[PDB]
């Protein structure tokens, strides 16, 4: 069901209930709970963290994630493994830092190219976007949070994709990332419990700017 492999080499499947979560720009994450069995024994007693999970959603959606948390509980004469995991197109960014302090004016392609140095992944902007200046680089910081700042300045949203090619992850940067979807919803047909919340405690009609 779920093909997991060490960071070096071969795969091994396990059946387990999964709980995935995906946001637009924020990190996706999943969680699941393996249990000891006559099966799964060779794996469960031999998982070390940063085990590489993949083949969620079957023989498709080969979005390879990595485990970082590992719980191990004892239930009866058996044992559970709750665990968590994160994307490689995000973790692989949390891998590397930049020490050269980016500073001054910066066009978007230059900025999101210096940060994709050695990672191998690829970025591209769709529409024309302006440029601004970044005051202090994150010399002691991830590529990820500088990516956050860059999105906050220039590309207000993004969307990753595992392109057809191996070891590639195209970052379509875009303001207000969207694609049309043929499906739909309604209270009768697909929407059990509609909680509409309208929060306005920090809201505005006119506003000043300097």
């Amino acid at each position: 069901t779920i093909t997991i492999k060490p960071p070096k080499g071969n795969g091994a499947p396990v059946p387990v209930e999964t709980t995935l979560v995906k946001k637009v720009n924020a990190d996706g994450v999943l969680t699941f709970d393996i249990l000891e069995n006559k099966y799964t024994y060779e794996v469960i007693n031999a998982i070390g963290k940063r085990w590489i999970v993949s083949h969620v959603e079957g023989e498709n959606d080969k979005k390879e994630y990595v485990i970082t948390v590992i719980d191990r509980k004892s239930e009866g004469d058996r044992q559970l493994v709750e665990c968590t995991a994160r994307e490689i197109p995000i973790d692989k960014l949390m891998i590397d830092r930049i020490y050269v302090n980016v500073t001054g004016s910066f066009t978007v392609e230059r900025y999101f190219n210096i940060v994709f140095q050695g990672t191998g992944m690829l970025f591209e902007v769709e529409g024309k976007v302006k440029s601004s200046k970044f005051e202090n680089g994150g010399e002691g910081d991830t590529r990820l949070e500088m990516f956050k700042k860059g999105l906050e300045h220039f590309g207000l949203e993004y969307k990753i994709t595992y392109d057809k090619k191996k070891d590639r992850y195209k970052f379509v940067l875009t303001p207000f990332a969207n694609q049309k979807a043929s499906y739909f919803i309604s209270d009768e047909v697909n929407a059990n419990a509609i909680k509409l919340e309208e929060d306005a405690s920090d809201f505005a009609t006119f506003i000043r700017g300097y």
Binding site: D27, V29, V69, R86, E145
Partner: peptide, 20 residues
């Protein structure tokens, strides 16, 4: 009394992978 721990534990779980 028994209850604070479960919620705080799930909270600390959620502290993993909440941030870009």
């Amino acid at each position: 009394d028994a209850l604070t721990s479960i919620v705080n534990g799930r909270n600390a779980k959620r502290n993993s992978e909440y941030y870009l």
